[PDB]
Amino acid sequence: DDQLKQSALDFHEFPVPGKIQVSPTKPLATQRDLALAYSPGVAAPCLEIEKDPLKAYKYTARGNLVAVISNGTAVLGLGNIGALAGKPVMEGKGVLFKKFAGIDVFDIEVDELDPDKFIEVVAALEPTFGGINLEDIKAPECFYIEQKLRERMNIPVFHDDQHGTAIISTAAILNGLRVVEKNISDVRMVVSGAGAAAIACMNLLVALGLQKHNIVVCDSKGVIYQGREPNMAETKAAYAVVDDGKRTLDDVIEGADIFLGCSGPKVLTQEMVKKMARAPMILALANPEPEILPPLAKEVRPDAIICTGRSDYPNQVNNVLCFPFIFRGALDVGATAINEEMKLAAVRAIAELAHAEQSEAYGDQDLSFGPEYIIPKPFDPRLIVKIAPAVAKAAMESGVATRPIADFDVYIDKLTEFVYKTNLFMKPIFSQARKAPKRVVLPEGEEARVLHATQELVTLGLAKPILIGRPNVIEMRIQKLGLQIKAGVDFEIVNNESDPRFKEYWTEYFQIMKRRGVTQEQAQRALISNPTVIGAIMVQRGEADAMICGTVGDYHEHFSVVKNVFGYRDGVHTAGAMNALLLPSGNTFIADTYVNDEPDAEELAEITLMAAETVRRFGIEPRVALLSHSNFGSSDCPSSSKMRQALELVRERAPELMIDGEMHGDAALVEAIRNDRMPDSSLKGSANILVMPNMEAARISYNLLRVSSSEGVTVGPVLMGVAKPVHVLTPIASVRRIVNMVALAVVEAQTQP
Amino acid sequence: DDQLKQSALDFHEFPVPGKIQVSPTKPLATQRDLALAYSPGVAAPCLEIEKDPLKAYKYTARGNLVAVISNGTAVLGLGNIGALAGKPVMEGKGVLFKKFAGIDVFDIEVDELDPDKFIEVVAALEPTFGGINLEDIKAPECFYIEQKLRERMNIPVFHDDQHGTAIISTAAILNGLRVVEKNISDVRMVVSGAGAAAIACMNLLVALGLQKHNIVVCDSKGVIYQGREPNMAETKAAYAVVDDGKRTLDDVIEGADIFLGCSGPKVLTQEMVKKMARAPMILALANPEPEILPPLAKEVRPDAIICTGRSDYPNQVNNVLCFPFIFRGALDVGATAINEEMKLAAVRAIAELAHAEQAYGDQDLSFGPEYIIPKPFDPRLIVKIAPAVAKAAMESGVATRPIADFDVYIDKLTEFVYKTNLFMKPIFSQARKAPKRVVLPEGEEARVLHATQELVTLGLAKPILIGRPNVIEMRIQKLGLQIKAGVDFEIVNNESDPRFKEYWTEYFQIMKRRGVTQEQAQRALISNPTVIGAIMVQRGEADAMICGTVGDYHEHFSVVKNVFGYRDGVHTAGAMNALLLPSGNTFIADTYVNDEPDAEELAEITLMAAETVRRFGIEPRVALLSHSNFGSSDCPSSSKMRQALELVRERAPELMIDGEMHGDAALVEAIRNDRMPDSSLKGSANILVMPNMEAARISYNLLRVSSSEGVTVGPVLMGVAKPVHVLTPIASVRRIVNMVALAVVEAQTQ
Ligand SMILES: [Mg+2]
């Protein structure tokens, strides 16, 4: 793409150059605080590391630090573009390391092409880092460098491209073998191209039972023929195929149970897939193009199982699926290196994650074990809970574990807390929108941000945009922005001034509002000036299915329009406004940020129920907490008494819901603070839904936190309780916020109308 | 020591090992956000660097990233201890880089001892960082390493221990020569100890006007004269003098205007100080012990100007004075290295900071014999030095990124200092200068006990604890605290005290018509500790009180308001909490006093909060928060805010404030400029007045968990006559110590 290619160039620059930053972890406010971080206090920690260098984890960041190193020789698929140009990728490793594994990571770019000299620099940096992740080092240098460094360095050395992708591919093979019911020793494996991971796949596969003679390796020149070259690379000589008269891939593909290979753009054809054995396993792992298109192989062989590196095709083999979770277990036991036994233990846990049953969505996915699901989702949360204990338990058995863990259950619980914090509810919602697009009206069609959103909604294919406004101003603005969206084709424009059904529309609005103080002469004025009214009428008739408005205008202008045309949903008598923020405590929400200035007891209860119902659908656990200036009966304020009555009310309508209150804000986010004021609290962990006692409390909180918590744009002001799928936005809402909200409306529009 | 050397070991251990962490700067909440960061969107910023390596600073962390590298051969005063053992010093280095100048730093510990492999490893790491910092490398290996690395690498390389110390020292001599009225060409300088900083300082001084024939150097063997040894070090040979028949320091110290010592302690004697020239400048920079102690030199010569490395003596020479700020100027213009023209303008920037003129800073910044080097924590350091570095680098021709306007540049620099101003440091220093008697009613509470130890050790206050003496002493032992009763602190037994009869009678006369009986007053003087300390402060037995660590806020506040009363001129009270937010130090009020303050009460709160922030040293930027944004909603809460704004402007026009506004408009200037271009408020406001307590309390709660890295000032009580503050049950020991320090400062001026 070019639309998404440019939004990343902007992302890597705004607001600050660079993605990662070194921040303090200990205070430094006072003058004594400086005398303990430096002179003369810092003398003591250094003198305890010369006494005992094993005590380095206690006083330094070495106990959770890994260096991603690269010379830029083969960055992803770009090639040798330079070590300096490869820095944004190495920073990406660290930011993914921190987001998922919580492992502080330094990006290191070494300007050395000589394999020996490069090895010296890395061995020199051993005391600095607790672990070394070798990244984007072209072949065959990587085989030599990684081998020498693991022996040389008493800290773990790992190659994510060579060994990491092998752990995923090996796990897929073992799982796929269980589905086709073929024993590993019997299957014959054929590998295309001199894949760096291919050598490690076989090694791991051999350690599990795969016969070497069954393995047939095919370099890009041809099949490996023993003796065709007197001088041969050690990786090619180790897996040597005796010359059997087979020169091409089409010669060895017949009678082959498994196909694999990093190298090769589109080496597999539809005719070669027919020639393969029963229920073939196809592992296509070339970044630009799969070895065979997965539908092309399914058409000739329905029993086949295909694995690609690309995310659109199922069974994604992502490097991000393992390499952070391996280092996490290794760093927690202080392993001297990552032995093959640990890597294998990771392969087991990854396959075990597919077998284990799913738990607890608006997005529609099935995780049942089958030909579509032989490897877990690329961003599955349970990865850390399973991979890290297995790596550490194997490391303690192997004897490289310097530091033991007394109880694995305590360690798992720490890992369990980290899982709760991170969730990606947005991605399944988007995919659900592609399955059944619905028409959505945007009343502010002439606004610049709406136009940018209209394109990205048309590009991803989420909904049918129906803009409102003077077409003349829209057409001009499109050409000034550089967009390729076509009126009457990509999106339907409705002019507020010229409309055939105009008389039909004002008669419906008048029949609704004749008694709410709207004359006929006013209603006709209304369907030309306020586009919110126009779209609102369209949804009730069926001309559209949802509406996203409020990108320019006071919230209550648009909300009063909605409230009158569609009315409350069934079984509701008050509406709610829920905003979201990405907090250290995880994804968190605020209740009634715009609707009711002073919500009463029963009104506050209905808001809570709708927010819980709406969060359940997102794929997030509803852990609700009512907030007040009172702490569990500190004050008898009428606003604090109202919160208490609401807790009792919700308990009778949805007793299964987890909620407690009232409490201070800190008590709802830190489980420790809550355990000292209330041990019996039904609330467990960080709460994600915060119901406010009044709007001022809400709007002051959402604002002050949006700036100082994080810039995670997820869902803006989510309106709840209205019978028709509608959401009203803030005027300062960014373009990314507009897109996300339109998708949310489509999934709500797929629901029973 | 054994307590300042044990508490240092606990400082690094908990709550998390280490002193730094890698933190994301970019959003990572949605799957698209992740895609833009790594595969595949990461390929776009990389392909732009394949076209031009200059686009790096624009798309990567370089230009704000510097590496502090060491081998472990000269770690402070410890010496060669290993590269691993020197890691905590390298973390503390870069953490000063960030806290003082905002320059992220990877510490790098190289496992090397041959200077050949060392230069290779570092030069290999050139593409990563925008600059290289060398620290704790033994001599003479450091000279050779730095020289080779500086020419080889086109990014700056700087030895902190030698060049940084030389820049400060050179500035000191220039200012001292103005004091003693001596031209630089005419003065004669003698140097003992061939330390790396001395050689560079002389080289720097020679470029500024100092004469080599006037300079005489003495190494351990003797006075460096030409032809003493056929094979001589190239650094030593540059300042060897014509043979004057003098081999001893005593022979050459005669008639000497400047003495600079990098050698061992006690090389200079009182007899040598007597025979120096008029008003000698003695730069006794030695650690851990100075060559000559300043008082012994002051006795023989009172007019002399002396500087050492230690902090307790005046005119302390500290590396933290320049080394963060030289790099900040070089990186903002992307200098290829650090040259002599910059190093001179740096000396010029530091010396010119002592002449210009200037309130919690008790230390008087008057240019004289005791002040020729600015203070270590001085705010204007980065504002002055970095522009001179960038300007002198642009004129020497090594900068790759021209700054068009130095005015906008200085503004960005000034905003960083005001945002990160450490108000706590000057407070603690003031508390050390004069301890005052402070009462802590919850004496049995462990956190209070822990806080008392830190107070005594630092010498902030003389504590008076109330409680059962049995339990306090028993808990002290269980905690392991070394404080002893009757000596470090006083205890007043609640159950039995000789002044009991006087206290309940004094309390009763204050509260007889407020619902307290004689019999009720007596029960209260044994059961409620907070009542006791209040009577003491009013009687004069104690100068201030810090309570509320246990109990609901309004119990302690009720007692306080009755006894102490409101200050003259104020009829309402307020509660302020402090947060170290990303936008800056931010205060919120009121959070515990008034549930629904009226307009006039809201205005007085604002005025008092302005006074308190001004006392801290931070400039007051005030914003009135409401759900309505500049009248978007007309309601009692919003109308109240607008009225208060007019009231505050009448009582004090100088105060910068605008309202009402949304929260985002107070923090993000961009949002406020769009909604109101004419807003008198500028930048990011630091004082947030609230419409009602319920919103303030729910804000501070959800914020103190969203900006966890700062623990500074707890609930500040504003308006009460006597120096009193009430805390929270969740108040950390950090918080109780800090608040007692605030209490002491307040009680000094009653
Ligand atoms: Mg790589």
Author numbering:
A (entry chain D): 2 to 361, 366 to 758
B (entry chain C): 2 to 359, 366 to 757
Text taken from the publication that reported this structure:
The hybrid-type MEs consist of an N-terminal catalytic domain (ME domain) and a C-terminal activity regulating domain. The PTA domain does not possess an enzymatic activity of PTA but acts as an allosteric modulator of catalysis; that is, binding of some metabolites to the PTA domain increases or decreases the enzymatic activity.
For structural analysis of EcMaeB, we initially determined the X-ray crystal structure of EcMaeB without cofactors (NADP+ and Mg2+) and the effector ligand acetyl-CoA (EcMaeBapo) at 3.85 Å resolution. There are two almost identical homohexamer of EcMaeB in the asymmetric unit although EcMaeB was previously expected to form a homooctamer based on the results of size exclusion chromatography and native electrophoresis. The EcMaeBapo homohexamer placed the PTA domain and the ME domain on the inside and the outside of the hexameric structure, respectively, as the BbMaeB homohexamer does. The hexamer shows the D3 symmetry, where the 3-fold axis is located at the center of a triangle formed by the PTA domains and 2-fold axes at around the interfaces of four protomers. The result that EcMaeBapo is the V state instead of the H state could be due to the effect of molecular packing in a crystal, which can limit possible protein structures. The RMSD calculated using 1900 Cα atoms is 0.51 Å, showing that the PTA domains of EcMaeBholo and EcMaeBapo are almost identical to each other.
